[PDB]
Structures are given as C-alpha cells and as structure tokens.
Design a protein around this nucleic acid. Structure first.
Ligand SMILES: Nc1nc2c(ncn2[C@@H]2O[C@H](COP(=O)(O)OP(=O)(O)OP(=O)(O)O)[C@@H](O)[C@H]2O)c(=O)[nH]1
Ligand SMILES: Nc1nc2c(ncn2[C@H]2C[C@H](O)[C@@H](COP(=O)(O)OP(=O)(O)OP(=O)(O)O)O2)c(=O)[nH]1
Ligand SMILES: [Ca+2]
Ligand SMILES: [Ca+2]
Ligand SMILES: [Ca+2]
Length: 341
DNA sequence: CCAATACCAGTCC
DNA sequence: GCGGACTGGTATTGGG
C-alpha cells in the first residue's frame, strides 16, 4: 500500500492571512472567546511567527497576550474555515476515490493504484501541494509511506509547507529508533506509562507480556502499537463510521434552573440532528459537566429509532434525573446519540 | 441473583 | 477545561 497524507499548515490562522494579506509577516493568533468573562477562552492556533514568540494552541488568551501583547488576536470563524476545508477536500477527491477525511485539516489518500512507487508518489504530492496553493493559496504538508501511521509521522516531521517520504527501509529503522512518544495516539500521559514499563521505541512493545501492556494502556492501544512494531498495521483508507454523535456546550453561567439550562440542551440536540443527517439513533445520553468539573450522565436505550421530537422530550426527563440525583450546579450540558439503525 | 446495562473517568488530538 | 468521540473499568439493576 502507498498512502499519501495531507495536513494543512497552521490552518485557521493561514485562512485569516488569505482573507487579509495585510496580516502576513505579522504574528497572528486565532482564538476561542468564551465570554464567561473578559478575554476568557483559549488559543485555537497561531501562525509560525506567533509561535516563535511563545504562543501556541491551547494556552489561555489571557496568557497569550501577557506573552505576546504585540500579536493580532482574531476570533475563530470556524464556518469560514470549514468552507475552505470542504473545497480542498473536494480537490483531493480528484486524486483518489479512496479518501479518508480525518479532520478539518487532515486527509489520507490511498494511492496504491494511482502510482507505482514512492518516486511517483512524491511527484503526486508536489502536484497536490501546487494545486491547493494555486486554488486556495493554502500551503500544506504531505507525508507519504506504506500506511496511515507513518504517512502522518512523515508529515509531522516535514511541516510546515513540506513533503516527506518514509520508505520501507526507513519504516524498519523508525520502529527501532523513533521515540514512541512521536507515534500518533501516544500523548504525554501514555508515553510516560510506557517509559515506566521500559518501552521507549515501538520495537520495545514486544519485550513485555501483552497482559502487562494491555493492563497499562488498554487492549486497543496495545494491539495498535504491537501491529505497528511488527509492521503489520494496514488499516484501510476510508472515512470512519462514527459510533456516536452529539454536542455538549458550556453555559454562560452555572445553574440548576431547568429552564435556564433547557435552551442550551435543545440547541445541542439541534446541532446533533444536523450532524446525524439520515442516521437514526436508538440511544440518547444527556451529559452534564458540574461546577467542579465532574461529568454526570443519564441515558436511555430504546428498542427503536429516536426522532428529533422524542429526543427533545426524553432529554428533559434525563436532565431532571441529573438535577434530582446530583445537587451541584451544572456548567456544561449536552447530548450524545449512539446505536444507529 | 448476576449478566446485562448504566455510569463515568480517562485519553487522544 | 473551548470540545468530539472512543475506551474500558466499576456500579447498578431487571426479569414479567
Ligand atoms: N487539545 C484540545 N483541547 C480542546 C479542543 N477543543 C476544546 N478543547 C479544550 O481544551 C482543553 C484541553 O486541556 P485540558 O485542561 O488538559 O483538558 C479541554 O478541556 C477543552 C481540541 O480540539 N483539542
Ligand atoms: N479550538 C481549538 N482548535 C484547535 C485546537 N487544536 C487544533 N485546533 C484546530 C485549529 C488548527 O488550525 C488545527 C490544528 O491542527 P494541527 O495540529 O495540525 O495544528 P495547525 O494546523 O494549527 O498548525 P500546524 O499543523 O502545526 O502547522 O485544528 C485547540 O486546542 N482548540
Ligand atoms: Ca493536523
Ligand atoms: Ca495542520
Ligand atoms: Ca506524542
């Protein structure tokens, strides 16, 4: 298999630069303003100039400004970003029928039957990069390898505005030499657990008994790493079928007032049914985050489909149950739908 | 009952 | 701690 992965560079901020060329060369920080109070919220992304001066995704806007008062701070316009994204994804569909949209700015193409080797793949990667730049003025990074995981690792290594092939011999070398913390799916918390077990590289995952590994990180992640280490990973390129779909929102203020909370819950349900499209759920869960940041959920599974109308009325009953059985104020409220017909 | 179900903490990016 | 979605461990419960 030959997999080509495309990851758009500093995507949100780059879109803002496209829409305002006056911003280029300036530090640009795109932000999620929460509005629970002043300048509350977090950095969604920053361009590479802003990162140079200490601002990165996830930090509080409050801290970002203290850090880089000099930057241009912009509200997230996700609807605008989604439109650019959708057009780019349609461009990519032209290069292969076998496409997997992983997120608003990432997609994998299975080009096994489109090119004969990694030389032609590299060439296709350049064509893709040029076309996206020509049509949307967005730079992207391309990663190419024998499976999805190494194609992404390649992009991670080459960004931004890059292209990289990890060929079959390099896959073998990296199984031995790559810090396992750099494997997709392994965050800092998981990397640390592995380090305690004596695992620093993919190849090390085989030095331990499965039950010990599975007991530390779970069976799913254990089989994932083991497959990678044995170079057997070969997951098909295709859009994932979601097992659940929902929406949970932060409220303007904490509350236990049923009718102060209902409007957020109901909007959550509306956004959920838009996302659901033609999928019909058999299960609904109302999910609350309390004032001190615990989660409480109450669900119901039916032996049949739940239309939007039954979702509304049942969600009320489930919310009442949360409020009856937990005396804390609620901070976030929403719904998740699952068990599709 | 206790297997089936419900809850819900943890994890990724 | 803005958030969607999935995983898997532990608590609760329904049968009729
Ligand atoms: N990392 C990450 N965080 C997000 C995203 N969307 C909203 N958030 C918010 O960022 C927070 C991550 O920080 P933690 O306090 O460690 O949790 C989440 O609680 C929330 C996202 O897409 N990625
Ligand atoms: N609201 C919010 N959005 C995020 C967050 N993290 C990433 N995003 C969105 C906005 C970014 O443009 C995109 C980030 O994906 P990446 O890890 O590839 O970073 P980004 O494209 O911004 O920069 P990069 O690929 O490193 O050049 O996804 C986050 O923590 N909060
Ligand atoms: Ca990305
Ligand atoms: Ca990106
Ligand atoms: Ca990592």
């Amino acid at each position: 298999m030959i997999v080509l992965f495309v990851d758009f560079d500093y995507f949100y901020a780059q879109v803002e630069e496209v829409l305002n060329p006056s911003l280029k060369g300036k530090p640009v920080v795109v932000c999620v303003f929460s509005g629970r109070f002043e300048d509350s919220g977090a950095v969604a992304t920053a361009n590479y100039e802003a990162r140079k001066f200490g601002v990165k995704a996830g930090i509080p806007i409050v801290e970002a400004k203290k850090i880089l008062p000099n930057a241009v701070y912009l509200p997230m316009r996700k609807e605008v970003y989604q439109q650019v994204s959708s057009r780019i994804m349609n461009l990519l569909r032209e290069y292969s029928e076998k496409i997997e949209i992983a997120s608003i700015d990432e997609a994998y193409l299975d080009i096994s039957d489109k090119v004969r080797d990694y030389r032609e793949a590299y060439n296709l990667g350049l064509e893709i990069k040029n076309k996206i730049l020509e049509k949307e003025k967005i730079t992207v990074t391309v990663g190419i390898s024998k499976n999805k995981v190494f194609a992404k690792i390649a992009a991670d290594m080459a960004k931004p505005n890059g292209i990289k092939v990890i060929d079959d011999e390099e896959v073998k070398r990296l199984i031995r030499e790559l810090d396992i913390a750099d494997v997709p799916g392994i965050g800092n918390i998981t990397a640390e657990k592995l380090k305690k077990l004596g695992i620093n590289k993919l190849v090390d995952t085989l030095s331990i008994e499965f039950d010990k590994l599975k007991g530390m990180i779970g069976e799913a992640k254990a089989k994932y790493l083991i497959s990678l280490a044995r170079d057997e990973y070969n997951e098909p390129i295709r859009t994932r079928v979601r097992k659940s779909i929902g929406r949970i929102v932060t409220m303007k203020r904490n509350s236990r007032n049923l009718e102060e909370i209902k409007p957020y819950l109901f909007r959550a349900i509306e956004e959920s049914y838009y996302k659901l499209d033609k999928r019909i759920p058999k299960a609904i869960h109302v999910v609350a985050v309390t004032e001190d940041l615990d989660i409480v959920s109450r669900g119901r599974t039916f032996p049949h489909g739940i239309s939007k109308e039954t979702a509304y009325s049942e969600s009320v009953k489930l919310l009442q149950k949360i409020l009856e059985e937990d005396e804390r104020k609620i901070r976030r409220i929403g719904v998740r739908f699952s068990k599709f017909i």
